[PDB]
Symmetry: C3
Subunit: 217 residues, 3 copies
Amino acid sequence: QWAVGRRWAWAALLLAVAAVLTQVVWLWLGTQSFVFQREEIAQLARQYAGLDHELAFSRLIVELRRLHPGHVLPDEELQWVFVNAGGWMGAMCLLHASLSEYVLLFGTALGSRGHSGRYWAEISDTIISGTFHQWREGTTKSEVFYPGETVVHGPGEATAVEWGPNTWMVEYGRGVIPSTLAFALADTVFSTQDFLTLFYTLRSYARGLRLELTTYL
Amino acid sequence: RWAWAALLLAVAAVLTQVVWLWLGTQSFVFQREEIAQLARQYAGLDHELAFSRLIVELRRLHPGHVLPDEELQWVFVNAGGWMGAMCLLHASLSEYVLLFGTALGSRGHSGRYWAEISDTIISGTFHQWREGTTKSEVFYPGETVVHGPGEATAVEWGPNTWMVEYGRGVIPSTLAFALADTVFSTQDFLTLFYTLRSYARGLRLELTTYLF
Amino acid sequence: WAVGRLLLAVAAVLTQVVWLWLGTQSFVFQREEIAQLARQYAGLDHELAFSRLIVELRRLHPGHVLPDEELQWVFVNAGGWMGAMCLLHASLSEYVLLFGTALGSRGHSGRYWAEISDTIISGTFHQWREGTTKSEVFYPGETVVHGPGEATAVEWGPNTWMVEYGRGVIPSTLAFALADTVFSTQDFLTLFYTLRSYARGLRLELTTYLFG
Ligand SMILES: O=C(NC1CCN(Cc2ccccc2)CC1)c1ccc(I)cc1
Ligand SMILES: O=C(NC1CCN(Cc2ccccc2)CC1)c1ccc(I)cc1
Ligand SMILES: O=C(NC1CCN(Cc2ccccc2)CC1)c1ccc(I)cc1
């Protein structure tokens, strides 16, 4: 009459949890929570552009630690490593690294030119010192960005880039990050053969990834 | 059973003789001086207007051998360490006419081709360092620089350098070099596709005009 | 007496033939010998300096410098930079070559299992050490040493020419110098030239070692 078979009820809950679980994973994926904001890294780095890049970097790192404790690499794991990709060369200092985000210090003391690359991500560069030249695809003119300005590099977009002597910046990336190192290490494999740098980069990502997991606990 | 291979080779032998004859009776749409003198006259203009003026004039002199506006496209070129942009106007198996240059400037290996490459400069500078030499030469707007087949030099484009380029030789082979960095350095396969497509479009045009 | 189912027997022999090998190693040039000599010719026109240096080098070490018929400028592409080299001496452990550019270049120094010192005859040499955010500049007369394992970013100005002496596991350094030649320029001809240059250095050294 008002009863329910205990056998039918057992299967109903299994169809229920299947329905609930499939709904739960979409809501969580949709949430898309990010640790940093695109305009925040740009606004924060703009303040230190007036200083010499050495003092600016050290001051910026200190500020970024107190804002987001547990999301920045410790001093013992901070390290400059060269970056060779797209035919240009620079140097990075990884500050933050997840599977969806990264924040790093980038720049050159000699300057360099090359292919920007096409990433499955959106990358924002804010100039602390020097110059950033950009040549968008399909155009015959270039633009130049000075200290205080920010150049954003959309996903799937390819440009030509040029850095002037002693150019430095704070960079924020957002997207499928492990796919980004695929381009960042292309010239390192086939042009420079610098496997020690290759180790440094992967170690920095790993130590950056380790931090994010343990902070989660 | 040995008669099967004979017929397969006989029909292969005759087709090879057809190709050989056809390759021998070939005539060229464009002349070497034709492109050089036509370019030099627009070199005094800004490169944007120089290009558009030249394209139209090239269409007027050789109708059916220049790509339509809907198939014109700037595509990045990455080879020999340097980087520039290209816009293909004409392309067969033996000839090509394109616009080339860079808004930033670039340096690298000239590349060794199975072709003769001629570049008349509209703007900027072209620096050349010939193999075996310890001095460089510079070419300015209005001048034409010639890169012979087999030759390898070191090249340097100053900022905002542009040129009209006419190539004559085994054109499908030159593609091999121009996409070398694209595979091993830039990994820009979208650009690779753009390049191969613009070539196909050029081949399609020449084929249709030939057949009507 | 029987032993059941050698490394100890093998390890002893191999280490004590390697240590015996390291002790019988003899270098043709001193660590600073090339640098002192090259320093004397800096400031001259690089072609004059090179010729004078080659004569003096042949005089100081007969049997270890390549003949005029085996001297050649070959393009070098590696780490994103491009230059030209003239090999003068080459073994498995040492090499002496003339290096430079007419246009200038920028790239990766490379990580060698060898120590490399460069004495500038003309131009400028910019060096950016790893882990630093500043660069240093060397002018004609100065010597830049590249220690084993070290990696820097280097830059040559237009008409920068130098004398280079390297010491260490030389064949491994050749792997780096041919990197861009193989994967970027596809210039097999230069790849042939360089390997031939190395072979000729090795041939001379083998002959000189055997028959004095
Ligand atoms: O070194 C990295 N990434 C490069 C590529 C983006 N910039 C250069 C650039 C290119 C185009 C437009 C703006 C800036 C410099 C940093 C990197 C290191 C570790 C991880 I984990 C992920 C990335
Ligand atoms: O990308 C192409 N060609 C390169 C190599 C020659 N450069 C000019 C140059 C560079 C160095 C020395 C001389 C001339 C322009 C870019 C190319 C694209 C489509 C077809 I179809 C055929 C070739
Ligand atoms: O081409 C060679 N080597 C390159 C890289 C080292 N120097 C250039 C240089 C780059 C960075 C810092 C200092 C010097 C000379 C050019 C080479 C050729 C034949 C043999 I056998 C061994 C090496």
